[PDB]
């Protein structure tokens, strides 16, 4: 038998590291059917912000138009979600891109010649030769132009390379960024890499104490296999640092003395946000969308 | 997105194919998990081509010659009545704009005849829509002034990599794409990466392409430490197996000696039976 | 040709680390592997983006038909 209180007095979570971008928190005593659901939503069904529609005016550079629009779409923006709702696709463009949903950024650059003593880099030989990410000037319009004063829309990676120009070339574009789920397109995935592994339960079966243990600590990572002295035990220090590689399996001496197992309830989460949010808020919103997904089916009538 | 092969012959650098990159590298795992691919087929991650995986374009040049000897067909318009709504592509000079979207049945060049006093539009009928990138003007040289009568226009077609394209490697395993699966329904490794490409492991007992296995060891062993291992066949022997030499590098890098990385299924979310084979290939 | 941003497999930004990679290989006499480690490339899915890029776009811009020579 299983109930909500039987799981509440059983489910805990630990933390291995706490960073502004990375995160490693270990879910303890939870089922795979829920772990993969959290991992699924954090990548497929979490809203983000990315450039959807791009309007160009003149591009005489070598890199063509659709590729430039694709690149300026790929570059992320350090803008916080929940400050702008979803657009309606069936509406026309003029009634689709309002101020509550659409954020407009512009890019204007005109390279020119700079006299200098000549192998010469384009920074000295030319002016405005390279186009970086910080050149994307965010422009606020509509009814709210002060709600982004303390939160200026800026690409989360200001050093992203966009294109290399030469004198005579000019680029002038006005692009719009919109929301989206990770399942719709790759640019709308605010998480770099989110997955989960299992705790390798290294169960020792025989008294491997001795010089054999000296050849055990070298195979596994250093912070895994430990001993009090040369004898009287051969234990494991930390079962999270190890790697499931079965390298001890290809040894005639260590073939059957130990088995690499698995824990059906010990999971770890490694989430690296793309800058739009924190690796913790991305988890609160992911489980919130899952709870709201259950709310939509709970409060809904049946048909036929 | 053409990239240099990590496992390249010593002669690949002699001619300098780095100037003209043919293909690129991609993480490939010999798995049957998908099922849609069988005995020839191949899959591509949805997020892979969503970011420019194997992107490519075409370039179709057209040569238009006017006036099928007083010349009567001149590029441009005249003076009498003519319908509007086709000025988005053509200019007042009789040439199309550089960059407009031109699908099948669009004006490329309009000509004004004097024998009929009408501006007829030479249509454009082809397979796929194209973007104009450059328009050349050509006029025969002579002691007397001669108006231009030959225009050379060059197109470009955004060929997004879809399924059914004969994707392959440098070992002779020609295949096609069955369906592009999403990343969340794609098996993920212990690190968290999802192999964007999965080739059928059942074609190896028949195709007998062991090269995509040993080179897959050298590919991952080269990407981990940065150093590139030259292929240059007929340098090893049975005493020194390349799977052993490429295996020891993975053993001291963290991976196993067999080059098999344990992964998890994306759909159900469980650990697979045994260690599965991964790696990058050109 | 151009530096691929948002590596296909992982999804991490790659475009910013190209100029820094060349700087580590020019001013510090630093090798290949340690460069990608200090530059912030852990997973081999994304290491093979900077480690393998060709950067042909510089060779493209050597022919400018909009200016003499």
């Amino acid at each position: 038998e299983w109930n909500v209180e039987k799981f509440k007095k059983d489910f805990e979570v630990n933390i291995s590291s706490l960073d502004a971008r990375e995160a490693n928190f270990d879910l303890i005593n939870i089922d795979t059917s829920i772990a993969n659901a959290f991992r699924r939503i954090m990548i497929s069904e979490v809203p983000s912000v990315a450039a959807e529609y791009v309007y160009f005016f003149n591009n005489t550079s070598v890199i063509q138009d659709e590729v430039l629009a694709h690149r300026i779409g790929l570059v992320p923006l350090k803008v916080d979600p929940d400050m702008l709702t979803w657009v309606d696709s069936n509406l026309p463009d003029d009634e689709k891109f309002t101020d509550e949903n659409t954020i407009v950024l512009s890019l204007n650059v005109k390279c020119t010649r700079n006299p200098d003593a000549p192998s010469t880099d384009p920074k000295e030989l030319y002016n405005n030769a390279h186009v970086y990410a910080r050149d994307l000037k965010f422009e606020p319009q509509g009814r709210q132009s002060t709600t982004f004063a303390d939160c200026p829309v800026v690409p989360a990676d200001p050093d992203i390379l966009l294109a290399k120009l030469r004198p005579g070339q000019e680029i002038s574009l006005k692009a719009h960024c919109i929301l989206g789920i990770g399942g719709d397109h790759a640019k709308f995935s605010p998480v770099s890499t989110a997955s989960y592994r299992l705790l390798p339960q290294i169960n020792i079966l025989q008294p491997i104490k001795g010089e054999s243990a000296r050849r055990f600590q070298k195979c596994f990572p250093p912070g895994v296999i430990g001993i009090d002295e040369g004898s009287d035990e051969a234990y494991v220090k930390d079962a999270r640092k190890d790697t499931v590689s079965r390298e001890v399996l290809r040894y005639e001496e260590f073939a059957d003395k130990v088995k690499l197992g698995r824990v059906r309830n010990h999971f770890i989460f490694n989430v690296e946000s793309a800058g739009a949010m924190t690796p913790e808020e991305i988890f609160f919103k992911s489980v919130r969308i899952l709870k709201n997904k259950a709310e939509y089916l709970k409060n809904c009538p049946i048909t036929q | 997105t053409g990239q240099t092969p990590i496992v390249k012959a010593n002669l690949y650098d002699d001619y300098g194919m780095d100037n003209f990159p043919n293909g690129f590298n991609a993480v490939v795992a010999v798995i049957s998990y998908t099922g849609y691919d069988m005995d020839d087929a191949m899959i591509i991650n949805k997020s892979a081509d969503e970011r420019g995986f194997g992107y490519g374009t075409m370039y179709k040049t057209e040569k238009v010659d006017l006036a099928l000897d007083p010349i009567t067909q001149h590029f441009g318009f005249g003076n009498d009545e003519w319908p509007k709504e086709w000025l988005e592509k053509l200019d007042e000079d009789g040439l199309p704009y550089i960059g407009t979207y031109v699908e099948e049945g669009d004006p490329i060049c309009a000509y004004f005849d004097d024998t009929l006093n009408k501006t007829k539009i030479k249509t454009y009928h082809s397979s796929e829509p194209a973007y104009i990138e450059e328009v050349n003007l050509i006029g025969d040289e002579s002691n007397k002034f001669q108006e231009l009568q030959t225009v050379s226009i060059k197109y470009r077609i955004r060929r997004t990599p879809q399924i059914g394209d004969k994707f392959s490697s440098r070992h002779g395993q020609k295949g096609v794409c069955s369906r592009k699966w999403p990343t969340i329904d794609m098996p993920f490794s212990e690190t968290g990466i999802q192999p964007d490409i999965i080739i059928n492991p059942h074609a190896f007992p028949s195709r007998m392409t062991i090269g995509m296995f040993v080179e897959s060891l050298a590919g991952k062993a080269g990407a981990l430490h940065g150093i590139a291992q030259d292929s240059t066949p007929w340098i090893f022997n049975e005493d020194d197996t390349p799977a052993d030499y490429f295996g020891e590098q993975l053993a001291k890098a963290g991976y196993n000696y067999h080059g098999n990385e344990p992964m998890y299924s994306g759909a159900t979310g469980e650990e697979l039976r045994a260690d599965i084979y991964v790696g990058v290939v050109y | 040709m151009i530096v691929p941003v948002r590596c296909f497999s992982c999804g991490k930004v790659v475009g910013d680390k190209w100029e820094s990679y060349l700087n580590l290989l020019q001013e510090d006499e630093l090798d290949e592997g340690t460069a990608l480690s200090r530059l912030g490339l852990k997973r081999y899915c994304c290491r093979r983006m900077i480690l393998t890029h060709v950067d042909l776009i510089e060779k493209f811009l050597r022919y400018n038909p909009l200016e003499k020579r």
Partner: peptide
């Protein structure tokens, strides 16, 4: 015959991605 030139100065960068050292 020369068997193979082995790499020199190798290290590890691998699992436990929540802390390197």
């Amino acid at each position: 015959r020369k068997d193979v030139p082995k790499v020199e100065g190798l290290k590890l960068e691998h699992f436990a991605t929540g802390y390197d050292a």
